[PDB]
Design a protein around this ligand. Structure first.
Ligand SMILES: C[C@]12CC[C@@H]3c4ccc(O)cc4CC[C@H]3[C@@H]1C[C@H](Cc1cccc(C(N)=O)c1)[C@@H]2O
Ligand SMILES: C[C@]12CC[C@@H]3c4ccc(O)cc4CC[C@H]3[C@@H]1C[C@H](Cc1cccc(C(N)=O)c1)[C@@H]2O
Lengths: 284, 284
């Protein structure tokens, strides 16, 4: 009857704006479960829900920790309709800084949440989609999963992993009628790079002066790129809707064509030397 | 005086054949620390050492668990010369099977060892290489880190992550004089896909009949690809030597040109549709 949509990571950003956008829909086609790690962060989701005046019953919140498969099961249990038509894997963690300055727990956590937690969603939800012979999976990707960035080593590691995970799955799912797509985001203006980085004080402690100086230069350049390229989460959310609406989804949707030149140069010098050279000069 | 080389994962395969190859070297240029998770598995490394008659003192073994940063530190401590000229990150875990058939621990472990453990090596060893303004890092990569394969979802996830990790680092390390390179391997005939997969009995338990059948078809095709394309670890080891010897290493060395067509098609249809189509028919 309604298309049932479960989204992870709805407390801010792309996930919040997509949950209520679908909400929301003048057509009333969508029943949305918006999941969040901490319910104390659900205020903005319910504010924004009021702003776009979502109908009553359009939006149910669930608590869901993607690092915890019992929590993934308990959120799956609470899906009354007993199917999910559109699973959106969007919960994600950032990590920014000199590699030797990152705590090993913080490294472990990004991988846990960004890769393993996506795996846990797909394990809990894919079986029944394959049995039904239908279902859409959308995954928040990043242009940092398509080309490496200085000081984003671990974030890019995590983002690249999702490409590996999802491309491998797509090759299998083709004849099942289950559709998986990555929505590849450039910079998005939400609230992103926040406490994804330690204090200058603590970062200097953990690295050399020359590396520290380079981090500042990367930050200056990143601020510039964001101010000249950063997209709306509203703009980003339409791309998810385009994929969810397509009769035969491709593997990747790009929310911006802007980085495609740069990605072309990675990909026709397989040695990686052109990319690394171009990016070094771009950043520094 | 001698080039000090520390390699991870030497109990078999590429790591074992590279440790003693360098060994070994009629020139006697190399002092090798060959690390292994379990010392009980060091027999083959010392057999092969006798076969290629490595000189006395050419090869020291260390125990090293890459999942454990105290173990990474204790192996670093035991490097008497007090520098490492060539760090080789080669320790790796496989995982093969339908995604829903993989244990969550087994998923966590592959990421821990293949990504986090590489991070731990680089944290322990990169600081002093940057201070010296010199050092080579070589990382075992796979063609499964460059394109996704059905039933290799998690392995490819891990392998893709290493591309993300290393490309991000290379962009920073360029003006430091520290050189990082991936050695991208196709199928290698060692002993690989062993207990990287559960029994047919246990896998059928954990999946549908149609997915199970497809797994068999992928295995049949994989056996064929290996029998028609699989390289020596001796052949693979020369590629590492080529990179270690290059005055200005590129980011990636390919031990085979054979998959480069296939990689070209990933990369000029950014939607991923051509790749996924070509590979689906290639495999099934
Ligand atoms: C990778 C990227 C697209 C490419 C951008 C680029 C392109 C070209 C260039 O020359 C410079 C730059 C710098 C900025 C880059 C963006 C960073 C942003 C990702 C990010 C990082 C840390 C935490 C989070 C989080 N909270 O989710 C998100 C976005 O995904
Ligand atoms: C990915 C790959 C290169 C591309 C190959 C290919 C290409 C084209 C094609 O059509 C089919 C196939 C099937 C075989 C594929 C290889 C599998 C092998 C990796 C592997 C897997 C599980 C555990 C370990 C471990 N113990 O380390 C290693 C190698 O790296």
């Amino acid at each position: 009857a309604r298309t049932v949509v479960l989204i992870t990571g709805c407390s801010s950003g792309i996930g919040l704006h997509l949950a209520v956008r679908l909400a929301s829909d003048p057509s009333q086609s969508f029943k949305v479960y918006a999941t969040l790690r901490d319910l104390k962060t659900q205020g903005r989701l319910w504010e924004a829900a009021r702003a776009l005046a979502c109908p009553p019953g359009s939006l149910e919140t669930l608590q869901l920790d993607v690092r915890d498969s019992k929590s993934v099961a308990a959120a799956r249990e609470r899906v009354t309709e007993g199917r999910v038509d559109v699973l959106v894997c969007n919960a994600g963690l950032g990590l920014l800084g000199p590699l030797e300055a990152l705590g090993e727990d913080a490294v472990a956590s990004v991988l846990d949440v960004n890769v393993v937690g996506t795996v846990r969603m797909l394990q809990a939800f894919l079986p029944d989609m394959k049995r039904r012979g239908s279902g859409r999976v959308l995954v928040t990707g990043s242009v940092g999963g398509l080309m490496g960035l200085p000081f984003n080593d671990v974030y890019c590691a995590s983002k690249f992993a999702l490409e590996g995970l999802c491309e491998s799955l797509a090759v299998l799912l083709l004849p099942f009628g289950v559709h998986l797509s990555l929505i590849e985001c450039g910079p998005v203006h939400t609230a992103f790079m926040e406490k994804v980085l330690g204090s200058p004080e603590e970062v200097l402690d953990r690295t050399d002066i020359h590396t520290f100086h380079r981090f500042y230069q990367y930050l200056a350049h990143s601020k510039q790129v964001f101010r000249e390229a950063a997209q709306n989460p509203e703009e980003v959310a339409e791309v998810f809707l385009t994929a969810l609406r397509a009769p035969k989804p491709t593997l990747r949707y790009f929310t911006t064509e802007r980085f495609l030149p740069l990605l072309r140069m990675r990909l026709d010098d397989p040695s990686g030397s052109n990319y690394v050279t171009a990016m070094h000069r771009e950043v520094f």
